[PDB]
Design an enzyme around this catalytic site. Sequence first.
Site, PDB file in Angstrom:
ATOM      1  N   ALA A 194       0.498  -0.471  -6.390  1.00 36.53           N
ATOM      2  CA  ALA A 194       0.766   0.257  -7.625  1.00 36.53           C
ATOM      3  C   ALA A 194       0.640   1.761  -7.398  1.00 36.53           C
ATOM      4  O   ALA A 194       1.468   2.540  -7.870  1.00 36.53           O
ATOM      5  CB  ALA A 194      -0.216  -0.180  -8.712  1.00 36.53           C
ATOM      6  N   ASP A 195      -0.402   2.160  -6.678  1.00 31.51           N
ATOM      7  CA  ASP A 195      -0.625   3.572  -6.394  1.00 31.51           C
ATOM      8  C   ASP A 195      -0.693   4.376  -7.688  1.00 31.51           C
ATOM      9  O   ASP A 195      -0.270   5.531  -7.736  1.00 31.51           O
ATOM     10  CB  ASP A 195       0.504   4.112  -5.514  1.00 31.51           C
ATOM     11  CG  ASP A 195       0.371   3.561  -4.099  1.00 31.51           C
ATOM     12  OD1 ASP A 195      -0.694   3.062  -3.775  1.00 31.51           O
ATOM     13  OD2 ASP A 195       1.339   3.644  -3.360  1.00 31.51           O
ATOM     14  N   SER A 196      -1.224   3.757  -8.736  1.00 31.41           N
ATOM     15  CA  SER A 196      -1.342   4.424 -10.027  1.00 31.41           C
ATOM     16  C   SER A 196      -2.500   5.416 -10.013  1.00 31.41           C
ATOM     17  O   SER A 196      -3.413   5.309  -9.194  1.00 31.41           O
ATOM     18  CB  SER A 196      -1.569   3.390 -11.131  1.00 31.41           C
TER      19      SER A 196
END
Length: 82
Positions: A36-38
Site C-alpha cells: 500500500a505504501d500509504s
Amino acid sequence: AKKETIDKVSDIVKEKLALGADVVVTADSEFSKLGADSLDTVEIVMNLEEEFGINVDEDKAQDISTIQQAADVIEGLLEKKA
C-alpha cells in the site's frame, strides 16, 4: 539511541498491522515498507507521542530518518520538551 527506545519505536509500526510475531525487527529498517505504501505519519507520530507521552511537533515528524533517527529524536523529547 537506546535499544529500549528503538524497540518501542519499531513496535509502533508493527502494531499498525499487528506484527512482531514471525517478522524480524531492525532499527536500520526505514519506516517505509512494501504494501500500500500509504502515509501514516499522523497516526505513527501520535502513537510514539502517545506511548512515550512526549510532545513531538509535525515539523519534527516530517523528515525523520529511519527508526534509528526516530529513537534518537524521541530520546531528546523524553528529556527536553519541544
